[model samples]
Target: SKPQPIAAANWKSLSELIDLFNSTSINHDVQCVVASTFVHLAMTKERLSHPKFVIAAQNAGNADGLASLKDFGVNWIVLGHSERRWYYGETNEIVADKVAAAVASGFMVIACIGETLQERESGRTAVVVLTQIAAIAKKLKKADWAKVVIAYEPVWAIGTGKVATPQQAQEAHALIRSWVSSKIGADVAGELRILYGGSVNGKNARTLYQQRDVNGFLVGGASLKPEFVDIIKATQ
Candidate 1:
């Protein structure tokens, strides 16, 4: 079967969940999900109650929100994003816990794992990201992997003017996928959808999405703009 790949628009603090939902036209040829702030999750579901639309949360936030993820028909939850890991002190252990809990409760996770500028400069990009994945892998079994989507967002490229060129994105994605195959199982890794983030916009999306291992985009800034429509269409 051909890849029925997914694209996630991550509005970290931000919607067009107006222009986007009112009009965030998605071609069923591709899979799309909107990661809205908690306040807008229910409304996002309310406004775009179509089969094509899958709503996600920026984070489960806390015990209460994680518990209610299903009540709003939200299944996707982001865990281990750089912002929370850096600013809020969400350690690797913490992220693994969050991921395990989410998967245990029947939700899919966009599991973020990437290296920082220093980590990259030190030539530990693979080590850093693989370590992050290892932590999560400890808590998950082969079957649980079906509910995970690995997003590789280089901490250096995120909103920092610099971006991961398509080649760079492909390399990192390939590395991660290969590691999963070796550490987990060939079949699970083959089925994995590894996404690339970091300043992804309309212009770079098609090139990035074209990568064999770059299954989709965990778009940040551009997801808030009308360009999000442009990003979504790249898959078509």
Candidate 2:
């Protein structure tokens, strides 16, 4: 499979953002999605007018909301985000359940996993991420794996303007690929797309995309800006 870039917009002003996205000239290969609140569900048809753009949910559990979102034409959902874990008390088990349900419901998922600054300082970054992936691995069947995308968003770096160095991102992504290989196989691991998310912006996107294991990105604040178009074109 070719590398597919995804730019997630969490916009406040929905109407303005819709106009921006509808008019933007995104690359044919980039997958544009709005992973915002449910209120924006009404804009799904208009948003998809760009051909490559899709709608996604920012967070979901194995709850009615997940089913409702799916019913509303949301084909993608982001699960296991650090904020959902830290602020909402979403454990790995909870994330696993959501991944299972979302995959079963025919939704593509971006399952996020990463460590905080303290965890990294304590030398538990790999341990923490592996544990998180293990939980999801136990819940998903091998076939379900095709619908899942992994996003590595170091908690300390998100929203802090501290992008991980290219080497650091590659190291983490390589570790994740190895873990997937152990669970499934080398072929599937190579086919898997592991995205680097923390503080990704136009300035750092090209260098990060240069890394072998760094397949794409799960962008944040930059997704709401014009620079997002640049990040989408970074790999090109």
Best by TM-score: 2
Local distance difference test scores for all models: 0.81, 0.82
Per-residue C-alpha lDDT of model 2 across residues 14-75, encoded as one tens digit per residue: 56666776787865676776677666667654554667678788776666877787777678
Per-candidate total of colliding backbone pairs: 2, 0
lDDT of 1 by residue, 1-236 (tens): 32567778787623334545555456557677888787777667677655666888876756667778777577888888998898889988899999988998888899998898898888998888889999999999999999999889998888885779899888999889898889899999988888888998888888877877878788888888777777877765
lDDT of 2 at 152: 93
TM-score of each: 0.92, 0.93
Query: Least accurate stretch of 10 residues (summed lDDT) in model 2?
Result: 5-14
Model 1 segments more than 4 A misplaced: 13-17, 22-25, 61-63
Instruction: Name the Cα RMSD for model 2.
Output: 1.8
